[PDB]
Structures are given as structure tokens and as C-alpha cells.
PDB file of C-alpha atoms in Angstrom:
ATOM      1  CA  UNK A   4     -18.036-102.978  13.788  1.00  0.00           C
ATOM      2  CA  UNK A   5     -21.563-101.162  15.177  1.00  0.00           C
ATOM      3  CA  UNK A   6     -23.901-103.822  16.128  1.00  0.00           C
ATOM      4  CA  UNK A   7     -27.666-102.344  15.797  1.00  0.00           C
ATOM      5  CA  UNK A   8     -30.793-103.413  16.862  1.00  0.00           C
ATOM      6  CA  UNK A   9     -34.616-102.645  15.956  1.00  0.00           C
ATOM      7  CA  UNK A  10     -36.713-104.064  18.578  1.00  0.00           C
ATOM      8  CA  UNK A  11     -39.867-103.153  20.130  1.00  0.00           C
ATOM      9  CA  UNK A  12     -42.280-105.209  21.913  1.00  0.00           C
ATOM     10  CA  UNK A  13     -44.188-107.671  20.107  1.00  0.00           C
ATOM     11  CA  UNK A  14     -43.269-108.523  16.133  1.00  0.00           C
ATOM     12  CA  UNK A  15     -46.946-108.984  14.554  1.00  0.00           C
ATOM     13  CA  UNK A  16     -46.356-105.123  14.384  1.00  0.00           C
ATOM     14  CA  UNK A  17     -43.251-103.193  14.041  1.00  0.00           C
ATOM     15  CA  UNK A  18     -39.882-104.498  14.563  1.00  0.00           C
ATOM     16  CA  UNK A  19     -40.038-105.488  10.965  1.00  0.00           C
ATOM     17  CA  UNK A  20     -38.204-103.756   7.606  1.00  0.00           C
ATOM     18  CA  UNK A  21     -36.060-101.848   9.676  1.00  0.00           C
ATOM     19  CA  UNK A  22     -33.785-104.332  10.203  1.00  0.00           C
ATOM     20  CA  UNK A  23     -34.178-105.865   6.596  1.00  0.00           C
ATOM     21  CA  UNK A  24     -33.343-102.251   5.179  1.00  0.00           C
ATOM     22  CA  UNK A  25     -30.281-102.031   8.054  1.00  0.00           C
ATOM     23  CA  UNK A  26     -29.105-105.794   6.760  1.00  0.00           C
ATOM     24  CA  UNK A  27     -29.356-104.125   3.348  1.00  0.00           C
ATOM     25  CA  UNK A  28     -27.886-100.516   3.658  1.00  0.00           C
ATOM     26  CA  UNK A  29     -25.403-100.895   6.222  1.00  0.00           C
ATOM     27  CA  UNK A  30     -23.822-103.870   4.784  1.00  0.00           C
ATOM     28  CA  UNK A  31     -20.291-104.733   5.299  1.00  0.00           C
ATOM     29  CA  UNK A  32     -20.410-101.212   7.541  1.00  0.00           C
ATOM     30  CA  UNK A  33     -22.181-102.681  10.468  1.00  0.00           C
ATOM     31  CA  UNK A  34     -24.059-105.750  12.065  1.00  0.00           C
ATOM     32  CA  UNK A  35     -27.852-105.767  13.069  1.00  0.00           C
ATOM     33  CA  UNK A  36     -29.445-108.255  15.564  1.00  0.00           C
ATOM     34  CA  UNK A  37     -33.126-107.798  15.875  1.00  0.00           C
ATOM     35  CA  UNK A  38     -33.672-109.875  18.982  1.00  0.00           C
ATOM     36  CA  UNK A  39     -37.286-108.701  20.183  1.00  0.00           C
ATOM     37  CA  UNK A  40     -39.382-108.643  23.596  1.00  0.00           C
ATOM     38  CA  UNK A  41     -42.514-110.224  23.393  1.00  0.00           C
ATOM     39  CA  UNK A  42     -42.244-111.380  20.180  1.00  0.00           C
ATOM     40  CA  UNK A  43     -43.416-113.751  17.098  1.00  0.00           C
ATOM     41  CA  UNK A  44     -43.202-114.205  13.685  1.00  0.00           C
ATOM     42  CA  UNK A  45     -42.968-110.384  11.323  1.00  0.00           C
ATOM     43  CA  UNK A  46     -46.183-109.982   8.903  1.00  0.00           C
ATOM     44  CA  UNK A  47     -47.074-112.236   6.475  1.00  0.00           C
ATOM     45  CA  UNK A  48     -47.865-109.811   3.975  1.00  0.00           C
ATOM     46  CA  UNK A  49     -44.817-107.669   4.903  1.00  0.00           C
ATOM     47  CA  UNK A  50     -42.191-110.203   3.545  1.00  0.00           C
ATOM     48  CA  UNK A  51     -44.007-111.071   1.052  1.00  0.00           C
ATOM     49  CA  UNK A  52     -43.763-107.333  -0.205  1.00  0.00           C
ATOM     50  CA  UNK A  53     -40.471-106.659   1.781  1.00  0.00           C
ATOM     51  CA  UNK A  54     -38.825-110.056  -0.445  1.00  0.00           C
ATOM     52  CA  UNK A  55     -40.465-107.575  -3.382  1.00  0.00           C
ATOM     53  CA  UNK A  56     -37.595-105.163  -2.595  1.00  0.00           C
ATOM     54  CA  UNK A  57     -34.756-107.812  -2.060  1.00  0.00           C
ATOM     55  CA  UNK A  58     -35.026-108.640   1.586  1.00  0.00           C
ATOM     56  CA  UNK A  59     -36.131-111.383   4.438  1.00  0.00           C
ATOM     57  CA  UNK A  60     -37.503-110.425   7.624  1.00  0.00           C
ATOM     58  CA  UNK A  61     -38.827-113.918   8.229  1.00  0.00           C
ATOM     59  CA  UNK A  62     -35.300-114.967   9.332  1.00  0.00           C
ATOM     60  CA  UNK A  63     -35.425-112.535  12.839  1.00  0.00           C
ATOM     61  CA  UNK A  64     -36.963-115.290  15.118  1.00  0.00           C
ATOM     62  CA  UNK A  65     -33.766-115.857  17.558  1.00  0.00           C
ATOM     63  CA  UNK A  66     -33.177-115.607  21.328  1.00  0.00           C
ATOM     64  CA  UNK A  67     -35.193-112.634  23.039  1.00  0.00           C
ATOM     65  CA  UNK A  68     -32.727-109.395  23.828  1.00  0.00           C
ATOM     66  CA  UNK A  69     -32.674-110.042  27.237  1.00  0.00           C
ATOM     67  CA  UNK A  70     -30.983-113.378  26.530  1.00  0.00           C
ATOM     68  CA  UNK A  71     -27.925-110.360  25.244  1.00  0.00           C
ATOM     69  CA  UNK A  72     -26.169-107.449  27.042  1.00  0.00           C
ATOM     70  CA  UNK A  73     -26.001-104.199  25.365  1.00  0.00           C
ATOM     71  CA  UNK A  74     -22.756-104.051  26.144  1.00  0.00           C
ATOM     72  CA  UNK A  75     -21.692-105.637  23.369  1.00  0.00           C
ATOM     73  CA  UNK A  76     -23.842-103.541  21.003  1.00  0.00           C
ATOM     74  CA  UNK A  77     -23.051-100.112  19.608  1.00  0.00           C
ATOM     75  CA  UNK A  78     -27.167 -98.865  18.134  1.00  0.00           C
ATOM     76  CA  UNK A  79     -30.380-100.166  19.569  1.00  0.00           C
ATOM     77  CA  UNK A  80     -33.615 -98.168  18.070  1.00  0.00           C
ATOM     78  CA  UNK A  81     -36.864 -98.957  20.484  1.00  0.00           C
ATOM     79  CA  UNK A  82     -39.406 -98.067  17.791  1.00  0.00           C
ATOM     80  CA  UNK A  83     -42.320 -97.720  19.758  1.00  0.00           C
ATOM     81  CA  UNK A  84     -41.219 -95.328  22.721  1.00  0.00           C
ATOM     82  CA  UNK A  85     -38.277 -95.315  25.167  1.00  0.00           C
ATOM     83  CA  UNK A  86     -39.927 -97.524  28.008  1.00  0.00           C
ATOM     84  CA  UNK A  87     -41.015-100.056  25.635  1.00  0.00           C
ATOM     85  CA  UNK A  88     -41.156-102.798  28.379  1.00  0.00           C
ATOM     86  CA  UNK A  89     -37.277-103.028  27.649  1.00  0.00           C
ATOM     87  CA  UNK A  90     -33.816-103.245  29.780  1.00  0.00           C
ATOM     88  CA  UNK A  91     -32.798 -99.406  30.400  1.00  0.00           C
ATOM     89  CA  UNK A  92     -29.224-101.209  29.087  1.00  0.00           C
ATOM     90  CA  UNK A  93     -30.543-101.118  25.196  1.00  0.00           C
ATOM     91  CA  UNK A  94     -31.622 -97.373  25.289  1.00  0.00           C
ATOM     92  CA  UNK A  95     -28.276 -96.250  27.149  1.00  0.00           C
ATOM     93  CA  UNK A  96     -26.543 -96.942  24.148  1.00  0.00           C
ATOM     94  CA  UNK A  97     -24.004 -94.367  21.929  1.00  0.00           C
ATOM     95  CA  UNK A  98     -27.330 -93.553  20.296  1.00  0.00           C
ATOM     96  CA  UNK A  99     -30.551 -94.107  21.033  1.00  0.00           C
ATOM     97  CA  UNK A 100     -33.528 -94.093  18.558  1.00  0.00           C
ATOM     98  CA  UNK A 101     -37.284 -94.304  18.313  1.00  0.00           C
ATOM     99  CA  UNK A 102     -39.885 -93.216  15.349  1.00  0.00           C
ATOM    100  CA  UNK A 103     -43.411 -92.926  14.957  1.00  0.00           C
ATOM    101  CA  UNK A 104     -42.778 -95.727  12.198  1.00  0.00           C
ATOM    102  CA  UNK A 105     -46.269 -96.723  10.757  1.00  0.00           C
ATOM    103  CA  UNK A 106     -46.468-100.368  10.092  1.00  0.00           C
ATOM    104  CA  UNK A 107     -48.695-102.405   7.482  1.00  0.00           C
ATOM    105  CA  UNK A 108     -50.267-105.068   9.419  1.00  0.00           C
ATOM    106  CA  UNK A 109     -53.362-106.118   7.958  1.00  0.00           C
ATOM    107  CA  UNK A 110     -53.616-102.516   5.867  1.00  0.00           C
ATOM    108  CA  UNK A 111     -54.112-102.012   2.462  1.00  0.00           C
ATOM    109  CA  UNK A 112     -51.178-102.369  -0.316  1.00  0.00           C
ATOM    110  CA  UNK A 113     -50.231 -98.635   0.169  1.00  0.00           C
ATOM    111  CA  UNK A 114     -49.426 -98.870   3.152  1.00  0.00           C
ATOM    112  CA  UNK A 115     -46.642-101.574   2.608  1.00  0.00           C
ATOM    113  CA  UNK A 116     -45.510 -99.063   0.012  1.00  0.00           C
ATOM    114  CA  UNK A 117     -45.325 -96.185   2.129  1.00  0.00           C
ATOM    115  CA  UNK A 118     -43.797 -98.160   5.324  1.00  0.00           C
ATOM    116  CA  UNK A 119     -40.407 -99.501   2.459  1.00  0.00           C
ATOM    117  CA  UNK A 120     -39.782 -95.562   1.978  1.00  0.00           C
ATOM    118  CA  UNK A 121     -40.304 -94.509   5.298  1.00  0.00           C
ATOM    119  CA  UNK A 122     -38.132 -96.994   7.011  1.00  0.00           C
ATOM    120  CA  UNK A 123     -35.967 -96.665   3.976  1.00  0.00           C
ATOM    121  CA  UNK A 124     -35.068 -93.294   5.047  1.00  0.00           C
ATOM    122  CA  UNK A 125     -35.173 -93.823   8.459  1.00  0.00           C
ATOM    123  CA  UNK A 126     -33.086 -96.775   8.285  1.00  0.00           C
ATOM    124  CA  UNK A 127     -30.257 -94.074   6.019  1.00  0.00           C
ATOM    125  CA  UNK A 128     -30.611 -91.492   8.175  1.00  0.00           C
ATOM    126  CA  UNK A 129     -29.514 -93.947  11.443  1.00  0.00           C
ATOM    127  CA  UNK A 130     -26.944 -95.536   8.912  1.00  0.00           C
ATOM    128  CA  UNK A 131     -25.196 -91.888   7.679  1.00  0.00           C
ATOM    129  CA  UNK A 132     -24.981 -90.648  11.760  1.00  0.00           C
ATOM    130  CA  UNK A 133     -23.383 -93.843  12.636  1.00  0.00           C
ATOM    131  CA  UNK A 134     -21.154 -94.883   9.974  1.00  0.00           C
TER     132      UNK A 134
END
């Protein structure tokens, strides 16, 4: 099945919900790995409200991507431009994605709200082009 990734650099901000929401909506349809570059723990705050809606993000913290070949993959979305001090072996993929995706980090509790619906439909509208 479609492996898929959501990894920018760094993890303190972005390369968090999308791949909660992918885990979520494209289960038993396709895989996600959300490896990272740079990276650390997602926002506190963010799985606290992101566990609100039925899903960990905690649980990412695994080998960096570069540690995997694309290869293997099928989806990798950058998030945070195509450069993204990233392989050029995750963007060459069957698709590749990248959003102006807001993020929550220290910002108020609307914020958190608005960043479940965007990457909701984000995360859909990857989902229904792929599978």
C-alpha cells in the first residue's frame, strides 16, 4: 500500500497533526511514516488537543528520514517548502506536496482549533488524490 510522509525540518513546529489525521483517515488504505529532519518532540499543547480529537502525535520520535530511501515510499508532503533542507529523493516522489499549514505552537486555543480543520482537509484532500 502508499506509504506517506509529513516531514519538514524541525518538529517543535509543523510536522505535527498531519500525520495523526493521515494515521486516522487513510487507515487500512495506506501507511504514514513521519520520520523528520532536524527534529524533536511535536507540541505539548498540540497532543494534548490533537488526543481531544482521537489521535497521538507524541508517538513520531523514530529514526530521521535520511536513515530511509524514498524508494520505498509512495507520498512524502515537505510542509514548509520544497528545499526544506531535505534529500531531493522525498520530493521526487508520485506526488509531491507542501502547504502554507499554520501551526499552534505556543498560540492561543483557536489556533489549535483552526490548525485540526485545516490539516483535516488537507490531510482528505492528499488522501482522495491518492487512494
Amino acid at each position: 500500500m502508499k506509504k506517506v510522509m509529513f516531514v519538514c525540518k524541525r518538529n517543535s513546529s509543523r510536522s505535527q497533526m498531519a500525520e495523526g489525521f493521515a494515521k486516522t483517515l487513510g487507515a487500512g488504505k495506506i501507511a504514514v511514516t513521519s520520520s523528520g529532519l532536524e527534529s524533536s518532540r511535536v507540541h505539548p499543547t498540540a497532543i494534548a488537543m490533537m488526543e481531544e480529537v482521537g489521535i497521538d502525535i507524541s508517538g513520531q520520535t523514530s529514526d530521521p528520514i535520511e536513515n530511509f530511501n524514498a524508494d520505498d515510499y509512495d507520498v512524502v508532503i515537505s510542509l514548509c517548502g520544497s528545499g526544506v533542507n531535505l534529500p531531493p529523493e522525498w520530493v521526487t516522489q508520485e506526488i509531491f506536496e507542501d502547504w502554507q499549514l499554520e501551526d499552534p505552537d505556543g498560540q492561543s486555543l483557536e489556533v489549535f482549533r483552526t490548525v485540526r480543520g485545516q490539516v483535516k482537509e488537507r490531510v482528505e484532500n492528499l488522501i482522495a488524490k491518492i487512494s
